[PDB]
Amino acid sequence: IVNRYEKLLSQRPEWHAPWKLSRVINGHLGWVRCVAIDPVDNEWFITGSNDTTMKVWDLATGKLKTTLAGHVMTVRDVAVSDRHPYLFSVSEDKTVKCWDLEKNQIIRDYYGHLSGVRTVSIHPTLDLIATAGRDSVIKLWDMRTRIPVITLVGHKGPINQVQCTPVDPQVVSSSTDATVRLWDVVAGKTMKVLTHHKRSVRATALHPKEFSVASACTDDIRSWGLAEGSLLTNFESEKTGIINTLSINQDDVLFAGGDNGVLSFYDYKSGHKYQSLATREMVGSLEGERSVLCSTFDKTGLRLITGEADKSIKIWKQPGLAWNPN
RNA sequence: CAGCUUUACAGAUCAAUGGCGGAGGGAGGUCAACAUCAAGAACUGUGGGCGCCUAUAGAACUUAUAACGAACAUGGUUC
Numbered sequence: 001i002v003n004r005y006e007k008l009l010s011q012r013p014e015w016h017a018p019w020k021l022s023r024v025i026n027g028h029l030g031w032v033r034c035v036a037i038d039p040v041d042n043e044w045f046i047t048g049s050n051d052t053t054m055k056v057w058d059l060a061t062g063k064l065k066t067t068l069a070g071h072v073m074t075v076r077d078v079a080v081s082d083r084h085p086y087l088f089s090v091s092e093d094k095t096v097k098c099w100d101l102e103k104n105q106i107i108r109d110y111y112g113h114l115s116g117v118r119t120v121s122i123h124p125t126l127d128l129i130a131t132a133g134r135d136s137v138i139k140l141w142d143m144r145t146r147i148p149v150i151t152l153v154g155h156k157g158p159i160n161q162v163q164c165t166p167v168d169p170q171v172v173s174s175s176t177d178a179t180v181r182l183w184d185v186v187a188g189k190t191m192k193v194l195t196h197h198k199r200s201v202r203a204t205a206l207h208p209k210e211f212s213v214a215s216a217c218t219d220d221i222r223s224w225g226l227a228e229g230s231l232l233t234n235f236e237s238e239k240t241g242i243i244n245t246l247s248i249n250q251d252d253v254l255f256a257g258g259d260n261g262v263l264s265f266y267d268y269k270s271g272h273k274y275q276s277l278a279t280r281e282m283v284g285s286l287e288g289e290r291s292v293l294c295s296t297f298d299k300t301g302l303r304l305i306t307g308e309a310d311k312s313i314k315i316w317k318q319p320g321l322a323w324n325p326n
Numbered sequence: 327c328a329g330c331u332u333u334a335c336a337g338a339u340c341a342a343u344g345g346c347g348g349a350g351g352g353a354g355g356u357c358a359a360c361a362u363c364a365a366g367a368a369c370u371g372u373g374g375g376c377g378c379c380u381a382u383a384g385a386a387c388u389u390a391u392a393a394c395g396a397a398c399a400u401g402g403u404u405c
Contacts, residue, residue, distance in 0.1 A: 106403070
C-alpha cells in the first residue's frame with residue numbers, strides 16, 4: 001500500500017558506524033561453530049568447534065587462554081552464565097556438559113537428549129538451563145539436580161536456537177519447521193507460534209535492552225517483541241545468503257552472518273541493512289568454505305566476534321547506505 | 327576454747343527483710359521426632375552507639391601431628 005511506503009520513506013535510520021576487520025585468530029583446527037563471551041567482564045570469550053575442543057580467548061591480546069576437551073563429537077554451542085561461574089557447552093555427542101570455571105573441569109553432564117544437541121541457553125535469572133537438539137524438543141534442566149525438569153513438545157522438527165528471556169515468554173525456540181515459538185515453561189505449553197518465516201529459521205537472538213528477538217530463515221530477518229508475540233520488523237535481507245548467525249549489539253546494530261560469508265549489518269528495528277562485508281580466507285583454503293558460522297558481540301558492543309569456517313575467529317572493530325525500500 | 331554463715335530443733339508476738347516459690351519427681355531404654363554438627367580458629371543472641379564499634383553476656387558437642395570415626399568401604403565424573 002501507498003500509506004505505509006510513504007511513511008517508511010519519511011522515517012530515517014540512525015548512522016551506525018561501519019565495521020572493519022581487526023583481529024583474526026587462526027587457532028582452531030576446525031569450524032569454530034560456537035562462540036560466547038562472559039557477561040560479567042569481557043576479558044575472555046570461548047569458542048566450541050568441530051575440533052571437538054573448545055578454546056578460550058583473551059579479547060585484548062587475542063591470545064589463546066586455554067583449551068577444554070570434554071566432548072567426543074563436535075561442539076555445537078556454548079553458554080557462559082552471568083549468575084554462576086559455569087560454562088555450559090553442548091555437542092552432537094548428545095552431551096550437555098557443565099564446566100566449573102573455578103577449576104576448568106566438567107561437573108554435571110546432563111543426560112536426556114536422544115540425539116545431537118544444537119543449542120543451550122542459560123536462563124538469565126533462574127539456576128536452570130535450556131537445551132534443544134535435533135530431538136525436536138527443548139528440555140529445561142534444574143542445574144542443581146542435573147535432570148530435565150520440563151520439556152516442550154510443540155515443535156515438529158529439529159530445533160536450533162533456543163533463547164531464554166526472564167519474563168513470561170521464557171523460551172524462544174526456532175526450528176527447521178520455520179516456526180519460532182514462544183513458550184510458558186510453567187504451563188508446560190506454547191503461548192504464541194510465530195510462523196512468519198518460509199524456511200528453517202536457523203538463527204535467532206534476543207535484543208539486550210529492547211525485549212525483542214531477531215530471527216532468520218534463508219533470507220528474511222524478522223524481528224519481534226515477544227510480549228504479545230507480535231511482529232516488529234522485516235529487515236532488508238533480500239538476496240543475502242543463508243543466514244547462519246544473527247547476533248544483536250547493545251547499540252541496535254544487528255549483525256547477520258551468511259553461508260556466503262557476507263557479513264551483513266543492519267540497524268535494529270529500522271530493518272535497514274547498512275553494510276555488507278566481503279569475507280576472507282587463507283591462501284590454502286577454498287573460496288566456497290569462508291562463511292561466518294557463529295558470532296556474537298561483547299557486552300559493551302564495539303567488538304563483533306565471528307567464528308568462520310576457515311578455522312578462524314575474526315573480531316571486528318568500527319557514510320551510511322541509502323534507504324530505497326521495495 | 328571464742329566468731330559468723332548453713333542444716334537438724336522446740337514453742338513463740340510474728341512485723342521486718344531476704345532467700346527454695348506461680349513451689350510436684352528421679353533413674354534409666356541397642357526408643358523415637360526435630361535442631362545442629364569443617365568455619366575469617368571459625369560460635370550465638372541482647373540492647374546501645376549508629377552493614378560495622380562498645381558493653382552485656384552466655385557456650386552443649388566436635389578439633390591440631392587437625393577433626394564428628396583414635397574406624398574405614400563403595401560409587402560417579404574428568405585427566
